[model samples]
Target: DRTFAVKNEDGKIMGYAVAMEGKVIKPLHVKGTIDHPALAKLKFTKSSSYDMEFAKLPTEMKSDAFGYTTEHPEGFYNWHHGAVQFSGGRFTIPTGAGGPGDSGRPILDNSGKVVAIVLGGANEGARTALSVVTWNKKGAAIKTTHEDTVEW
Candidate 1:
């Protein structure tokens, strides 16, 4: 997925986001950048237009964890397991459970409600735990760290 800077009308960047097949969700920040900009008409013109109802994430934690990823890109990858560990606003899913490019993926419950999103590891040792972003009381997605805003 390509990450782009979200700029306001004044051209000041308001945030960043992943450029999915559809328009990027209203709020999200991605770590990296690409050569192009998806501004104004350039973004809305990406075809496959349709309306879809999306659900909001829950602020409460769930017992299970399941998700899909584009780790290999050539094929899909996924995992399903009960998250027996959660620490300091993050989930310790299994070591190597996810890798590079897996950030921003969903961690869902049996009902398909998003519990958290894969925040990826900053260092090799950190990879043992799958950093995640949970929701607040208002159901707004919360980034665990300040770096989640500026760097990722």
Candidate 2:
């Protein structure tokens, strides 16, 4: 799987996300947040390769999207490129389109900005949480509506 086991101070696996290979590691979580708080911003291991390019959250995506998933797991390098929709605080791809271990895989627009992170799904569609870079070159929050939701 192209994800890491996010652990707590007790050395317990809490959740997973695709992480940057070498950087001051940061992560995102849910409202209830994998049963942990924003104080739970700690990681012990590294996830697979994550090219941390971010799109403006809640962007207008009026065309097809492209992303990589562990769909074939162990063979035939493949991708998920199609139309998608964003609503609430997340996104939805068509039902039963991706595969297991695809959660948190970065979705990208045609211009190559991260659109979303595959969260999970239901009969309706594949659910994805929108992602953000959190900070910019000057390390300041972008001060947008969506930026207000994520806490440091």
Candidate 3:
């Protein structure tokens, strides 16, 4: 699922769009899959802080997002990615997952091409939140709208 928004040339508000790109299938409960060792089996309470303002920049920002996700819905041991790992940040947070400017981590394909954006995560040293992973449809066309507004 991909969420997009448009800003005027002056960096003002415009509109937003959201889309999902992936195969739709019956929701499967594989949390107990023997092969998936990365799954968590415990529960941990955490606090999360979301900073949307920082998420509105181009994919060249040098900051990281912080947040957490659950491997199971029962509030099991949570997973968190607290760093933007790519081409930014002065000091990297150990075990902290980092991405590019508010653009998020690019989900690459076999050809090393980006297919999706890793959305959602914690920020500012806070943890425990929902993971908002998003992907775009292959070859999806980009659309934009323009409007004029009067400011006093």
Candidate 4:
């Protein structure tokens, strides 16, 4: 999966590309950029973008912790737990942007309904851009759309 803002020849942000499997969903930031291959086109962002980390809850703590009562997450990756343990650095958004205190709130990828809640965040200044995480939850096909005004 891939998600990145594309720009036009005029240095204006054109749109964002979210590629899944062999198909691509290109959401335009501006109108008409979808047909203009030069203005915005399909680009492979990365391979590991679709991978998710999960762990099985041990029997001793399973019932209380994950409510598994014995169930465990598939492809369990131990030695790392909680939100800040990913190989990448912690993700954050500006404090006042949303949520309580200085923590960055997660961004949702909505098709027809919300798909996933993109995670990772920290303090005020540390809070920056919203991260995207692909989820196989409730939602429909994501279609490309554009607005008349630029999103700040």
Candidate 5:
């Protein structure tokens, strides 16, 4: 698994994103002074193409995608991508259709916790790569709307 630190403007760590084989497995948020012991056990691994996509995303957009709320309890739609939820604890990839892929894009919440991963579809006939989307949050609210899409 690979770990990425989420820091605030002051450079203080707020949380971490743990990914395995290019798919984000968990997102841990630091609620208080106590440090999560599991953080110490995780090791940094090689970066994948999905990691590169996530790195290119704007910090603001990442924050909104990962934040949780009543309206967006299961995270928010990432346009052409997929749903992004806060707290990447456990998720099942669809079996028949858009199941998990070898690589995935990690979505981050406001606190920098990896909320969800956008995996690729693996069926008999599928697109080479899913369409790309751009998103942004509105004000302090955790609402995000897709601005555009890019065909692959």
Candidate 6:
């Protein structure tokens, strides 16, 4: 699954592509409050370059500690188990492992270029849920919305 930002003709980021599937794509998710005069089009061909950036990462790159910031009043750290695996042109970051945020995670390549974003994920087992997103090898997606802008 891949995520794309939906924008208006004025270039305002209206919302995001929540779920996109198939070679010929359709918008599985869209914005509610923002309205456009014309029928909004999907920028399907302009996909992010996250997959390429992930490829440059060391295959054996694994960290013992994974951390995240939350609204919780207390501080927390995930150090039990963390790993990064790349296969089939995408990266699979197991839940609790350090990665990009749900709104947009930047996958930076060797030259400091942003190649992809971590849109979201799911869990197969009780302890683990996979964060799934999209990737491109040469660039990053445009920012039309911020994580705090929407309430999921």
Looking at model 6, residue 97 earns an lDDT score of 53
Candidate 5 lDDT over 1-152, as tens digits, reads: 24445444565554444333233232221211112333333343333422222222222233323432222244433422344323232222323324322223444445544434333332223222222111224422121212231111
State the weakest 10-residue window (summed lDDT) of model 1. Answer: 45-54
Model 1 per-residue lDDT at 23: 31
Error of 6 at 35 (Å): 23
TM-score of each: 0.40, 0.34, 0.21, 0.27, 0.22, 0.29
Off by more than 4 A, model 3: 1-6, 12-105, 124-130, 134-152
Q: Cα miss at 150, model 2 (Å)?
A: 23
Higher TM-score: candidate 2 or 4?
Answer: 2
> How displaced is residue 114 in candidate 3, in Å?
3.3
Models sorted by lDDT, best on top: 1, 2, 5, 6, 4, 3
Please tell me which predicted candidate would have the highest lDDT against the true structure: 1
lDDT of 1: 0.38
TM-score of 5: 0.22
Q: lDDT tens digits, residues 2-105, model 4?
A: 33344456655443433233333333222223323322433423333332222232233322321001111222122111122222322233443433211111
Of models 5 and 6, which has the larger TM-score? 6
lDDT of each: 0.38, 0.36, 0.24, 0.28, 0.32, 0.30
- Residue 100 in candidate 4, Cα distance off native in Å: 24
lDDT of 4 at 6: 41
Compared with the true structure, model 2 gives a TM-score of 0.34
Task: Give the per-residue lDDT digits (tens) of candidate 3, residues 1-152.
Answer: 23333333455423222222221110111111111111112222221221111212222221322222111112112112333232121112232344222222333333333322333333434321222332234533221111221110
lDDT of 2 by residue, 14-122 (tens): 4344432222222343121222332234433432233222222112221333332212111121125355555543344555555443444445554444434544444
Output the lDDT of residue 53, model 6.
14
Error of 6 at 23 (Å): 25
C-alpha lDDT (0 to 100) for residue 41 of candidate 2: 45
Give the candidate number with the greatest TM-score.
Answer: 1
Q: Which 10-residue span in candidate 3 carries the lowest summed lDDT?
A: 24-33
Candidate 2: residue pairs that collide: none
